[PDB]
Design an enzyme around this catalytic site. Structure first.
Site, short mmCIF file in Angstrom:
data_model
loop_
_atom_site.label_atom_id
_atom_site.label_comp_id
_atom_site.label_asym_id
_atom_site.label_seq_id
_atom_site.Cartn_x
_atom_site.Cartn_y
_atom_site.Cartn_z
N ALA A 152 0.82 -1.20 0.00
CA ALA A 152 0.00 0.00 0.00
C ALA A 152 0.86 1.26 0.00
O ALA A 152 0.57 2.22 -0.72
CB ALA A 152 -0.94 -0.01 1.20
N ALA A 184 5.63 -10.59 5.11
CA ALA A 184 5.18 -10.80 6.47
C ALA A 184 3.87 -11.58 6.56
O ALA A 184 3.42 -11.88 7.67
CB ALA A 184 5.02 -9.46 7.19
N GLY A 224 3.36 -3.19 6.31
CA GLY A 224 2.93 -1.83 6.61
C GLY A 224 2.72 -1.59 8.09
O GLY A 224 2.96 -0.48 8.58
N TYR A 283 -7.18 -0.62 -7.27
CA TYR A 283 -6.19 0.13 -6.51
C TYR A 283 -5.70 1.35 -7.28
O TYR A 283 -5.39 2.38 -6.67
CB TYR A 283 -5.01 -0.78 -6.15
CG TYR A 283 -5.27 -1.70 -4.98
CD1 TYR A 283 -6.00 -1.27 -3.88
CD2 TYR A 283 -4.80 -3.00 -4.98
CE1 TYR A 283 -6.25 -2.11 -2.80
CE2 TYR A 283 -5.04 -3.86 -3.91
CZ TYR A 283 -5.76 -3.41 -2.83
OH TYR A 283 -6.00 -4.26 -1.77
N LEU A 340 7.15 20.91 8.43
CA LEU A 340 6.46 19.79 9.06
C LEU A 340 6.05 20.10 10.49
O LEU A 340 5.07 19.54 10.99
CB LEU A 340 7.34 18.54 9.03
CG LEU A 340 7.62 17.98 7.64
CD1 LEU A 340 8.55 16.77 7.73
CD2 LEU A 340 6.31 17.61 6.96
N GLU A 394 4.79 22.86 11.55
CA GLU A 394 3.56 23.64 11.55
C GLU A 394 2.33 22.74 11.50
O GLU A 394 1.26 23.13 11.99
CB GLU A 394 3.56 24.62 10.37
CG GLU A 394 2.55 25.74 10.47
CD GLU A 394 2.92 26.93 9.61
OE1 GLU A 394 4.13 27.12 9.33
OE2 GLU A 394 2.00 27.68 9.21
N1 GTP Z 1 -5.61 2.39 -0.83
C1 GTP Z 1 -4.84 1.33 -1.04
N2 GTP Z 1 -4.88 0.27 -0.16
C2 GTP Z 1 -4.09 -0.82 -0.37
C3 GTP Z 1 -3.25 -0.88 -1.47
N3 GTP Z 1 -2.60 -2.07 -1.43
C4 GTP Z 1 -3.01 -2.75 -0.33
N4 GTP Z 1 -3.94 -1.99 0.32
C5 GTP Z 1 -4.63 -2.33 1.58
O1 GTP Z 1 -3.65 -2.74 2.51
C6 GTP Z 1 -4.08 -3.87 3.24
C7 GTP Z 1 -3.08 -5.00 3.05
O2 GTP Z 1 -1.79 -4.55 3.40
P1 GTP Z 1 -0.57 -4.56 2.35
O3 GTP Z 1 -0.01 -3.18 2.14
O4 GTP Z 1 -1.03 -5.17 1.05
O5 GTP Z 1 0.48 -5.55 3.10
P2 GTP Z 1 2.07 -5.30 3.12
O6 GTP Z 1 2.43 -3.96 3.72
O7 GTP Z 1 2.62 -5.45 1.72
O8 GTP Z 1 2.69 -6.44 4.09
P3 GTP Z 1 2.72 -8.02 3.75
O9 GTP Z 1 1.70 -8.71 4.62
O10 GTP Z 1 4.10 -8.55 4.06
O11 GTP Z 1 2.40 -8.25 2.29
C8 GTP Z 1 -5.45 -4.26 2.71
O12 GTP Z 1 -6.40 -3.78 3.62
C9 GTP Z 1 -5.58 -3.50 1.40
O13 GTP Z 1 -6.91 -3.05 1.25
C10 GTP Z 1 -3.21 0.18 -2.37
O14 GTP Z 1 -2.46 0.14 -3.35
N5 GTP Z 1 -4.01 1.28 -2.15
#
Ligand code: GTP
Ligand code: ACP
Ligand code: GDP
Ligand code: WZS
Ligand code: CA
Ligand code: CA
Ligand code: CA
Ligand code: MG
Ligand code: MG
Ligand code: MG
Lengths: 438, 423, 341, 54
Positions: free
Chosen positions: A12, A99, A146, A224, A252, A254
């Site tokens: 994401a 992960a 994330g 996405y 940043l 502010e």
């Molecule tokens: N808005 C938005 N949400 C996203 C996107 N990609 C994944 N998500 C959201 O993120 C969540 C999943 O987390 P990810 O970012 O895919 O997982 P990660 O950070 O790659 O970590 P891993 O588990 O190791 O794959 C889900 O709820 C998705 O809806 C994106 O490109 N845009």
């Protein structure tokens, strides 16, 4: 001029980062090869866009960004994409296996083995900064990377850059575009260890972006790409004051000063309008009042909630396009007499307004239509706690049965950190009710 | 490059494994000689998940064929896609297992296992990033059941942090080779409970009833039953074999499907099953997919509750309509889904449909109703064990009654565990 | 096949509504903690509105308006009228009221005494009543009683000249049920009830609150003149015609409809769900007083009112028609009076 | 309804309108958490290898 380093963590984070830097280049006139014909100071300069773009002797403008993902498939797109020439290989970091939606796996198992590397790459960009302000971190709540690796990074950044600010753009989990059942766990785990390390965090509920794409853009099943093009628009509005000449939210620091009077309540609500479909035959251009009035409609908030039943601690209006101060005040006075805007007694009832004359840029071929004027409102409502409430409820339903907990314990995490993180949320919800309830 | 090593053990395991590779090889555009002759890049996108790439653009399955008698594997190597398997990957003995778990697990199988691990070790070493292993086998025989679980316990010792998945055919008296099948099946279930991350329970009685009642096949054969297993194995691995998002790898699927470590036994479901040119609407795919008659474990889901569900729709359809029908099924039957796991039904779409179908749906269910499958085996087990009937086949191979009592006790606990979560 | 949940087991009103729903064969009731619901008959206190409207593919509805407490609280109603320009401080149908916090805790003590003293000098009736009950003409007794308690109180004027029914010479009050649907149409049930005092009104003794308070519990000469001290609009109408030569609609109903419109239309921007991710409807109970001049006053507003025994069937069936089926249709001569706006 | 701090430049302007006045762990502690989690995993895997050897 003070530099800002952007950090994109997880799928994401990386994909949203791709959308923003695409928009940044289109706005600042930087071509995919890094060249900028307008920059008359070749190889250097202390201009506004320099806070986000470094300069080489060849005249290339390189984003001050680092991309981190524990699985190489999402960042390999960047390495061979349209803007592949923007970044140098040092800026893109990837592992072998991710992960698996497991916070503990991203924080402990895999994170421990790559944390010192990411820092070394950030240190490389910091060395090019003559006056670093802080970092902007993009990541999802639900993903294992994330959530897990971000919070480990946030701790290290506080240790290695204690005097620098940190802003988060966090993707709140939405079942309509998610398939991981344990995202409530990761969301609350990452908020606990990241809370004391963040200065200002903008939450984007994927359910909000999803509904805006279907309702305003007429995308029956948004992807996405649709979600991220829209998200980067809001991000551009929020980061515009750092990249363009101005006087509001110039650094940043502010952002905390203007949006965060209470340290633990640092989640401002973002609202954006207008969102018009490019496929629309042709829309009647909305006025200052109509787009400003739209800022108090739940249907264009980044997080569905009802600000009418909270109290405001701060409100900031950021306009882009043909907007004059006279019209803004004429709309505000019209909204105070109609809307229910209750401020906390210890905060002044007022609005900080920023106006940038260049209208929003739209990616050619995207979904959004060219508009003459647009506004993004940043308001600190106690009503955003509704999103924590929803998330906490799902956590409790599963933790009562210890469902899935063995996946985290199996990655070295102790079960206690669950209730430790949950209790911190019960504390976060108690602060919100002390502020906006009589 | 997230590779998976496939293993097929015993008569049932190799006959079903053969059909499986015949099905997906066709989907990925690989002919019997391992040459690619497709027309879509989606086929080769994730092709390295199951296939190795040899000289001359050849694709050789990453599969290991194991048996204690040569009869079955000789037929594979003489069958349709016989020439596709790596010749070195055939590991067989001459003694046989005589439908005896003890022979497959302790005596005859022990003699041959070390040479099977040499092949596993060879296939894993060539993997840029090994996901894990999947094993096709029956539980009622001797080799697939006894030696199959022996391979799992030995491979686990050498790759303890990888993922172990199984397609396990459960015996039924309605489709029986020997009376000792409940003994072998109970001994194996104990192993699977402790050593696998995911087990797709494929009940031969469910397969039989589907062939007789739904498909209108008067005299079902193992060949007919293996057709359903092929279609299901193809469906449940679609998430892995094509560019997708949810349940993309083995560990991620497990994280979302297994809320409690011991409860990792899934009920697979497939739709349609026609006895054939008419188009099947999205509502129809959904009603059949969840209808018990389309389920292949022989457990009425209305007897228990779904902990988690993984749905997969293949073909060009309305993803908007898919989301509607899925939400419709859940909302119209929320009493059969545990309410303490929010959003526990996940759906995936794939644009490539199986051969000869405009669209289809594969269903992966973790339901507490699976407990009735272990109840059948437990009742059949104790019926003979209380009289110690047929134990001499096993005690004569070095086993002791105590080992039987333990396996029985572990499966009854498994049942009681499902029961508590059903309430 | 719509689904609903029950979270208020003590609601006699919605206990019947739930009974009718299941009787249609098209509504299935789920456990009180199942989120995949279309309709929520929620609890009274701490109803979790923040969780509504977040179930994909589910149109969710609830039987309460978030924020309606501003109207259904003694202290909140006083502050709403005084501060809302729509109602203004010069509101003519609401008794002069004040918010008085006990001394053990803004507050309107001095403002209350300024008016009280003005009456004591102008020879005017200075009989007040506090509540959150004690009636007294001396301000010392009123304020001293609120201090003995530990919760917010309100002191409002006591209607010394109430309209008395004959025979009997007895006080009374009027209860109107008002249903507001998801669209914010204000529907007024055609059937009200008058809770009468079976005791003759005595203005020279506020110590015996039996002839002054017309609550069905306090009274319960019970049932002498009318069954259960409850008179309905048919009998009350014929009485106004025989005694005063006027109808209930002209002398009283026009004013009640005006008061109901004013109150709800005022807080509409604060509680409307017209643009919300979930929808709301709510049943209200308005209590009114009538004086010997046939002027109608607003006593209070109830957010979880019960219904007269004789009218549970008709009204509950009405809640299903215009509030529940209007959102979830099934496969007259309306009992409501729509207050257009 | 007052306007304050009106700043103007070629690329825009900002101002403030007031309607109504008012009324960490060290690098060491982190490396300990990380190694503790790595140790609990090593213990769990040692118990498995011990179980398998039996
Ligand atoms: N808005 C938005 N949400 C996203 C996107 N990609 C994944 N998500 C959201 O993120 C969540 C999943 O987390 P990810 O970012 O895919 O997982 P990660 O950070 O790659 O970590 P891993 O588990 O190791 O794959 C889900 O709820 C998705 O809806 C994106 O490109 N845009
Ligand atoms: N200002 C006033 N002057 C005279 N009498 C009054 C009055 N306010 C209330 N009363 C009397 O008190 C009764 C209303 O009491 P109130 O409604 O405050 O208590 P309550 O809320 O427990 C009953 P409910 O909520 O069901 O109407 C009326 O019947 C009326 O006779
Ligand atoms: N579905 C299916 N089941 C089979 C097949 N062959 C055998 N079985 C079942 O598997 C059990 C016999 O196991 P088998 O594979 O012959 O044992 P092994 O050769 O020692 O591994 C019995 O319960 C049979 O019903 C087959 O081709 N398809
Ligand atoms: C939680 C649970 O059920 N577990 C059983 C399954 C285990 N993982 C698979 C182990 C393996 C690895 C390679 C070969 C064979 C087996 C983890 C613990
Ligand atoms: Ca420059
Ligand atoms: Ca800090
Ligand atoms: Ca031998
Ligand atoms: Mg990822
Ligand atoms: Mg056999
Ligand atoms: Mg009351």
């Amino acid at each position: 001029m003070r530099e800002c380093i952007s950090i994109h963590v997880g799928q994401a984070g990386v994909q949203i980062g791709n959308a923003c830097w695409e928009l940044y280049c289109l706005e600042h006139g930087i071509q995919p090869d890094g060249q900028m014909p307008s920059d008359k100071t070749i190889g250097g300069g202390d201009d506004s866009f320099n806070t986000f773009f470094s300069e080489t002797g060849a005249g290339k403008h390189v984003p001050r960004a680092v991309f981190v993902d524990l699985e190489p498939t999402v960042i390999d797109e960047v390495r061979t994409g349209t803007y592949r020439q923007l970044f140098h290989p040092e800026q893109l970091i990837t592992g072998k296996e991710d992960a698996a939606n497991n916070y503990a796996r991203g924080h402990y198992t895999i994170g421990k083995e790559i944390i010192d590397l990411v820092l070394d790459r950030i240190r490389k960009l910091a060395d090019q900064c003559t006056g670093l302000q802080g970092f902007l971190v993009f990541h999802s709540f639900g993903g294992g990377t994330g959530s897990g690796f971000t919070s480990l990074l946030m701790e290290r950044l506080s240790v290695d850059y204690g005097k620098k600010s940190k802003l988060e753009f966090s993707i709140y989990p939405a079942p309509q575009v998610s398939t991981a059942v344990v995202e409530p766990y990761n969301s609350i785990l990452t908020t606990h260890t990241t809370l004391e390390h963040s200065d200002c965090a903008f939450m984007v509920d994927n359910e909000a972006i999803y509904d805006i794409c279907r309702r305003n853009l007429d995308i029956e099943r948004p992807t996405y790409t649709n979600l991220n093009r829209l998200i980067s628009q809001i991000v551009s509005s929020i980061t515009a004051s750092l990249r363009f000449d101005g006087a509001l939210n110039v650094d940043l620091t502010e952002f905390q000063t203007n949006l965060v009077p209470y340290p633990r309540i640092h989640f401002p609500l973002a609202t954006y309008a207008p969102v018009i479909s490019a496929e629309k035959a042709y829309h009647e251009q909305l006025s200052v009042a109509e787009i400003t009035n739209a800022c108090f409609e739940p249907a264009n908030q980044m997080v569905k909630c009802d600000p009418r039943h909270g109290k405001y601690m701060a409100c900031c209006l950021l306009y882009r396009g043909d907007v004059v101060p006279k019209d803004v005040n004429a709309a505000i006075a019209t909204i105070k007499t109609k809307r229910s805007i209750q401020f906390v007694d210890w905060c002044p009832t007022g609005f900080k307004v920023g106006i940038n004359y260049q209208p929003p840029t739209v990616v050619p071929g995207g979904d959004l239509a060219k508009v003459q004027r647009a506004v993004c409102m940043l308001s600190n409502t106690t009503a955003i706690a509704e999103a924590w409430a929803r998330l906490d409820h799902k956590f409790d339903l599963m933790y009562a049965k210890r469902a899935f907990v063995h996946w985290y314990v199996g990655e070295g995490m102790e079960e206690g950190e669950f209730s430790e993180a949950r209790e911190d949320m019960a504390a976060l919800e108690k602060d919100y009710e002390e502020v906006g309830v009589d | 490059m997230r590779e998976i090593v496939h293993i097929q053990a015993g008569q049932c395991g190799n006959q079903i494994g053969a059909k499986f590779w015949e099905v997906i090889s066709d989907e990925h555009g690989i002919d019997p000689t391992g040459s690619y002759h497709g027309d879509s890049d989606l086929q080769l996108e994730r092709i390295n998940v199951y296939y190795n790439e040899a000289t001359g653009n050849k694709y050789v399955p990453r599969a290991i064929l194991v048996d204690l008698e040569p009869g079955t594997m000789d037929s594979v190597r003489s069958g349709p896609f016989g020439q596709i398997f790596r010749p070195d990957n055939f590991v067989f003995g001459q003694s046989g297992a005589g439908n005896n778990w003890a022979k497959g697990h302790y005596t005859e199988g022990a003699e041959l296992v070390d040479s099977v691990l040499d092949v596993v070790r060879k296939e894993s070493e060539s993997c840029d990033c090994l996901q894990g292993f999947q094993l096709t086998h029956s539980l009622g025989g001797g080799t697939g059941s006894g030696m199959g679980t022996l391979l799992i316990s030995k491979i686990r010792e050498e790759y303890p942090d990888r993922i172990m998945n199984t397609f396990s055919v459960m015996p039924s008296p309605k489709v029986s080779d020997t009376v000792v099948e409940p003994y072998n099946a109970t001994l194996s279930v104990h192993q699977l409970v402790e050593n696998t991350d995911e087990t797709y329970c494929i009940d031969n009685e469910a397969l039989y009833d589907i062939c007789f009642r739904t498909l209108k096949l008067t005299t079902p054969t193992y060949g007919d039953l293996n057709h359903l297993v092929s279609a299901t194995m193809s469906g449940v691995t679609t998430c892995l074999r094509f560019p997708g998002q949810l349940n993309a790898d083995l560990r991620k699927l497990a994280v979302n499907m297994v809320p409690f470590p011991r409860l990792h036994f899934f009920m697979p479901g497939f739709a349609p099953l026609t006895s054939q040119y008419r188009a099947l609407t999205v509502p129809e795919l959904t009603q059949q997919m969840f209808d018990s008659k389309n389920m292949m474990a022989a457990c009425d889901p209305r007897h228990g509750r779904y902990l988690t569900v993984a749905a997969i729709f293949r073909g060009r359809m309305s993803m908007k309509e898919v989301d509607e029908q899925m939400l419709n099924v859940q909302n119209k039957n929320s009493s059969y889904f545990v309410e303490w796991i929010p959003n526990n039904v996940k759906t995936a779409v794939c644009d490539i449909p199986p051969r000869g179908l405009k669209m289809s749906a594969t269903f992966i269910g973790n339901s507490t109703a699976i407990q009735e499958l272990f109840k059948r085996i437990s009742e059949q087990f104790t019926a003979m064990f209380r009289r110690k009937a047929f134990l001499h086949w096993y005690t004569g191979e070095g086993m002791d009654e105590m080992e039987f009592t333990e396996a029985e006790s572990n499966m009854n606990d498994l049942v009681s565990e499902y029961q508590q979560y059903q309430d | 096949m719509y689904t609903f949940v029950v979270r208020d087991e003590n609601s006699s009103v919605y206990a019947e509504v739930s009974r009718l729903l299941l009787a249609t064969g098209q509504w299935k009731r789920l456990r009180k903690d199942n989120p995949r619901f279309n309709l929520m008959l929620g609890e009274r206190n701490r109803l979790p509105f923040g969780r509504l409207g977040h179930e994909p593919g589910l149109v969710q509805l609830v039987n309460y308006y978030r924020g309606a407490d501003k109207l259904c609280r003694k202290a909140s109603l006083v502050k709403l009228i005084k501060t809302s320009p729509e109602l203004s401080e010069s509101c003519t149908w609401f008794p002069e009221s004040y918010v008085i916090y006990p001394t053990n805790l803004t507050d309107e003590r001095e403002v209350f005494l300024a008016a009280y003293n003005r009456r004591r000098e102008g020879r005017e009736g200075n009989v007040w009543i506090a509540k959150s009950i004690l009636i007294s003409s001396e301000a010392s007794e009123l304020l001293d009683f609120i201090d003995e308690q530990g919760q917010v109180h309100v002191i409002q004027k006591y209607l010394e000249k109430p309209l008395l029914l004959e025979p009997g010479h007895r006080k009374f009050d009027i209860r109107s049920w008002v249903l507001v649907d998801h669209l914010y149409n204000i529907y007024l049930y055609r059937e009200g009830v008058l809770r009468t005092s079976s005791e003759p009104y005595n203005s020279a003794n506020f110590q015996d609150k039996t002839c002054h308070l017309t609550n069905h519990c306090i009274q319960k000469n019970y049932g002498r003149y009318e069954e259960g001290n409850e008179m309905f609009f048919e009998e009350f109408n014929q009485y106004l015609m025989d005694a005063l030569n006027t109808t209930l609609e002209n002398s009283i109903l026009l004013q009640i409809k005006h008061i109901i419109r004013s109150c709800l239309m005022c807080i509409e921007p604060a509680i409307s769900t017209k643009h919300l991710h979930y929808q709301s409807f709510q049943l209200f109970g308005f209590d009114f007083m009538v004086d010997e001049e046939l002027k109608v006053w607003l006593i209070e507003v109830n957010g979880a009112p019960a219904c007269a025994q004789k009218l549970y069937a008709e009204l509950c069936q009405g809640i299903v028609d215009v509030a529940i089926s209007s959102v979830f249709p099934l496969a007259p001569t309306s009992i409501f009076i729509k207050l257009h706006h | 309804m007052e306007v304050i701090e009106l700043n103007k430049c070629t690329s825009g302007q900002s101002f403030e309108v007031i309607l109504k006045p008012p009324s960490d762990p060290s690098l060491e502690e982190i490396q300990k958490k990380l190694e503790a989690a790595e140790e609990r995993r090593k213990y769990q895997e040692a118990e498995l290898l011990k179980h398998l050897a039996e």
